[PDB]
């Protein structure tokens, strides 16, 4: 009748915004070569193939990437399995000995500062009472002059004795498929023009996310997932000059980077079973490692990012690019991994042009560090061992990280300078499309129906 | 219908439809509420959070008018101050997402009226099957 009655309906699909843990997945291809040759193979499970991607209708869901969850716990998760791939390797506390060190046997010119220091030292042997005199090659970003005579020490040794990487474990990223536990769901926005926040008007629930590769970079986030058609910037908000304007573009820029110094691995036994690895002899011709990008794709992609960066500032705006501005070494360069080696390459020669409102290759030099201090903790160093051969790798530049300078009082030039800073913004471009929700069933709704007594 | 002309029965599959369309596919949100070093502690606390949420909803369902019935009527009439809508505009036009925002302020009074209605009806069944 007119006196309607409540029914409890169970399993109404509605959702609310929530905060929870997530859960891994990876391919089957990672388990073919097996048992911790790369990380997370004893950690988390194989996926279901073909992620069940269900598009919805007539739903507007409010997305936000900057107050988002799940990008924090990837930043804890990578650090946690980084520690889990560094626990059972060998501590290198007997290495910190006073070095007797000299130049490598090279034709020295006065302008070029030598990148190799050939140090020899005392080291214990397998028997504790005999000791051996051994020699090694080191890079000048890993050795300091302690105070005629030139005796040197390793740079970490007044902070913490620290840990060699095992050469079993590799460093290339396998993709991680993030996936939802029972009782939550993962929503994906699928608009092309989408700058971060507000209503997305076409959503899709998914079971697991797509292929996300955790690849560390400071500037120039690389092997990342492209946009759909245009070039898009994204921001927390633009006029604040503290949060990183991050730009993502469609066609990649192919970047070839290489070390040509042919290296020899040498094993020294520290004591019982502590196989220390060092550089042996440098054969071939000693050079500096370097990155290469093609000129025409760089000029055209910089034209596209200044075209889509002029929309937020007015059309009569002179936009130039400078290089990075200061700070320590792992924010002035872009710093990246290639095949088991670390590179720190000075990107002055990319970000230097102005623009007006009306065969060909760029090279850039690059230094090699060996003690890294990843995520800037106190008592940690990862020692990379050195690899044989000329090392080269190609990659895809996709997205850049830019912070402004505080351009003030009316003059319409606005500088942009690349400098990455925080580690999270190489993941937040990779994960700007999902949010997590909690299903709350038991809706309550009226009808014209009364229960029999 | 189904198949090539289907509003999609998938997981959360018709979530923007009208509530008359979502009144059919209702087990599809029920049955995906169970399934699913230091990492196993996180995994096990995910699964026991899942079954603790599901047990709290089964226990909250059961002490009202229905044990596990999944479509469940009761004996408290509907108030005009909760919605002031007609039946046809919520069964022919409105979505469940928009319904849950229209009646979010009117929660935790309906559950109290459900508890009193079921508890007084259970004591009415107790005295009705007592005196005969």
């Amino acid at each position, epitope marked *: 009748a007119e006196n309607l009655w409540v029914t409890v309906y169970y399993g109404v699909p509605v959702w609310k915004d929530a905060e929870t843990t997530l859960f891994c997945a990876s391919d*089957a291809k990672a388990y073919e070569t097996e048992k911790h040759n790369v990380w997370a193979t004893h950690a988390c499970v194989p996926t279901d*193939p*073909n*992620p*069940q*991607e*269900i*598009h919805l*209708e007539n739903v507007t869901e409010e997305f936000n990437m900057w107050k988002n969850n799940m990008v924090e716990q990837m930043h804890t998760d990578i650090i946690s399995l980084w520690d889990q791939s560094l626990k059972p390797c060998v501590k290198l506390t007997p290495l910190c000995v006073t070095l007797q060190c000299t130049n490598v046997t090279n034709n020295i010119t006065d302008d070029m500062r030598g990148e190799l220091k050939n140090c020899s030292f005392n080291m214990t042997t397998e028997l504790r009472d005999k000791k051996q005199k051994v020699y090694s090659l080191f890079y000048r970003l890993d050795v300091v002059q302690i105070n005629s005579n030139k005796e040197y020490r390793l740079i970490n040794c007044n902070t913490s004795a620290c840990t060699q990487a095992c050469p079993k474990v590799s460093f290339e990223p396998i993709p991680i498929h993030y996936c939802a536990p029972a009782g939550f769901a993962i929503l994906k926005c699928k608009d092309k023009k989408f700058n971060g926040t507000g209503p997305c008007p076409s959503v899709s629930t998914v079971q697991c996310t797509h292929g996300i590769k955790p690849v560390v970079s400071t500037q120039l986030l690389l092997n990342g997932s492209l946009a759909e058609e245009e070039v898009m910037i994204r921001s927390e908000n633009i006029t604040n000059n503290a949060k990183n304007i991050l730009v993502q573009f469609n066609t990649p820029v192919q970047i070839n980077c290489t070390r040509p110094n042919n290296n020899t691995r040498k094993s020294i036994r520290i004591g019982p079973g502590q196989a220390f690895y060092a550089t042996g002899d440098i054969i071939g011709d000693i050079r500096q490692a370097h990155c290469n990008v093609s000129k025409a794709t760089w000029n055209e992609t910089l034209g596209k990012v200044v075209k889509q960066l002029r929309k937020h500032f007015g059309n009569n705006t002179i936009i130039r690019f400078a290089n990075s501005s200061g700070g320590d070494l792992e924010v002035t360069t872009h710093s990246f991994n290639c095949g088991g080696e670390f590179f720190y390459c000075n990107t002055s020669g990319l970000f230097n042009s102005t623009w007006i409102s009306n065969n060909d290759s760029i090279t850039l030099p690059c230094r090699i560090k060996q003690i890294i201090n990843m995520w800037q903790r106190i008592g940690q160093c990862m020692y990379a061992p050195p690899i044989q051969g000329v090392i080269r790798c190609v990659s895809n530049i996709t997205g850049l990280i830019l912070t402004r300078d505080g351009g003030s009082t009316n003059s319409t030039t606005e500088t942009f300078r690349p400098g990455g800073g925080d580690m999270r913004d190489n993941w937040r471009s990779e994960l700007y499309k999902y949010k997590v929700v909690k299903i709350e069933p038991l809706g309550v709704a009226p009808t014209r129906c009364k229960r029999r007594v | *219908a*189904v*198949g*090539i*002309g*289907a*509003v*999609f*029965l*998938g*997981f959360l599959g018709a979530a923007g439809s009208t509530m008359g369309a979502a009144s059919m596919t209702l087990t599809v949100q029920a049955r995906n509420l169970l399934s699913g070093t230091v990492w196993g502690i996180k995994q096990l606390q995910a699964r026991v959070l899942a079954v603790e949420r599901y047990l709290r909803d089964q226990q909250l369902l059961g002490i009202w008018g229905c044990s596990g019935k999944l479509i469940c009527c009761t004996n408290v009439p509907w108030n005009s101050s909760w919605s002031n809508r007609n039946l046809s505009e919520i069964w022919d036009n409105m979505t469940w997402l928009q319904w849950d925002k229209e009646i979010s302020n009117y929660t935790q009074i309906i559950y109290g009226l459900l508890e009193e209605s079921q508890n007084q009806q259970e004591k009415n069944e107790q005295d009705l099957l007592a005196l005969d």
Partner: antibody
Amino acid sequence: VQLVESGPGVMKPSETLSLICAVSGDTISSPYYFWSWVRQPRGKGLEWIGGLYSNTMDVYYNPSLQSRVTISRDTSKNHFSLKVTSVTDTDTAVYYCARERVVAHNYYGLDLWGQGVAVTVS
Amino acid sequence: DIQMTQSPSSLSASVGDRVTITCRASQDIKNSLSWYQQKLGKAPRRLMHHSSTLETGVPSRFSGSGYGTEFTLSINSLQPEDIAAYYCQQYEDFPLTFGGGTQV
């Protein structure tokens, strides 16, 4: 983009009828595509075996032949497989795998079909 | 389970004709039939979905009408490639079932 099926059919009754359908040009992980296996013996009608969607889990058959037939689908080889156990002589037929649009979510699909293979069982 | 019945069965008409072929169901479907055209030894080329709007790549010489349960195909201009099989198929509930078979 073309669908290639495979499987020879000259076998004995009450046995392992196995058919593979695959895509060349595109992928099977594209969303919202009705997959179908439909057979037809010559002289007889167009008989429906199996049909599912591209992006869910729940699968469907004809109940009159359901203990004989099952289906499978995997994207690591992009395979769409029909299995029949316990055949009779009423499976000497041409067989078609088919990709159809779901018309509420897809105005831009290509209603794809396989060429159909002929299976003869003595 | 829903049965379908396609009437009539066998035809042979002259050129330029207008052939009509209807089919009926066992319960009410009201929006849901698709029409498929299968030549000899070939894959069935679909005429249409949802009985009133067509597929691209097929001209306006075919049509379907009806509402509810009985539905009807009409070809107003017969071409010589039309001597083949045709099928109406339901998509109301699982399983899908075709028509009987048109021998035109």
